[PDB]
Amino acid sequence: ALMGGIVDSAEVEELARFAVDEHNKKENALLQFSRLVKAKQQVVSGIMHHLTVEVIEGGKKKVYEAKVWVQAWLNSKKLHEFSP
């Protein structure tokens, strides 16, 4: 197993919801969080969550890959990447 590698929840669900809201805020977007289809986590300085999320964009279902960087001890949570 890769140390610091990507490997396959209530908290995870909120992180997925967090990614979509964060993205809507930054891009003045109107994505509707539909569901977390798949989740993987990776240890970095903290945790990098690789979330596969289904949203509704203009009435149409679409799947995005979101990377949410969490550093719990600093109460920090950041949308690192977001794209189809």
């Binding site: 140390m3 610091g4 970095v44 001890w73 600093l74």
Partner: protein, 212 residues
């Protein structure tokens, strides 16, 4: 072996680093052990390049994870440069070792500590800093504020760090998450619980550099 070991007191450990958003812990772990053996063998404490290993270890996956053992094999084969000549960027780039000039240091090999053996690990820690692995994904580990940590945590290891000492009831670990985590960046993990995996699977996979 001694009752207490702490390589920081022997001047064999550099300041705590922060790997950031990159899954480069395997390189940081390797580097701590190289900084340590080099101080032990030459009397000098220097900082070596995690970036170099991140970019150049073709067996590892850049910021997507890697292996402390292949990084250490790389240093035994080609040496390593100083951290300031090859600084950390937090992202993998192309290998530029040969763009820098002569290496700063070189090791002679790599050895593995017999796994799942607490005494073998302490024995090796007594000799030099050792690259070890553990499961750090758990919330308790993430929030570690100090004290001798017992978890809870499983044994599905996912993070590489470095053991730089120990005591009657703990093993001293240098983490790579900045000084704002744990005890100024370190963690004391409980030992002696009769768990062969080690707390958080700490005895799962340990390597150290050999320097003639």
């Amino acid at each position: 072996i001694p009752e207490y070991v702490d390589w920081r007191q022997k001047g064999a450990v550099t300041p705590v680093k922060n790997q950031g958003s990159c899954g480069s812990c395997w390189a940081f772990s390797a580097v701590v052990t190289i900084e340590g053996i080099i101080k032990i063998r030459t009397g000098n404490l220097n900082e070596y390049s995690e970036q170099e290993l991140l970019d150049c270890d073709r067996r590892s996956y850049g910021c997507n994870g890697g292996y402390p053992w292949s990084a250490l094999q790389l240093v035994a084969q080609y040496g390593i440069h100083y951290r300031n000549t090859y600084p950390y960027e937090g992202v993998q780039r192309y290998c530029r070792s040969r763009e820098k000039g002569p290496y700063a240091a070189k090791t002679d090999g790599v050895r593995q500590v017999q796994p799942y053996n607490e005494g073998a690990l302490l024995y090796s820690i007594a000799n030099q800093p050792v690259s070890v692995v553990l499961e750090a994904a758990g919330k308790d580990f993430q929030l570690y504020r100090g004290g001798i940590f017992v978890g809870p945590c499983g044994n599905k290891v996912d993070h590489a760090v470095a053991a730089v000492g120990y005591g009657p009831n703990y093993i001293l670990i240098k983490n790579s998450w900045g000084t704002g985590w744990g005890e100024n960046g370190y963690i004391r993990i409980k030992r002696g619980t009769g768990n062969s995996y080690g707390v958080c699977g700490l005895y799962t996979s340990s390597f150290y550099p050999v320097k003639n």
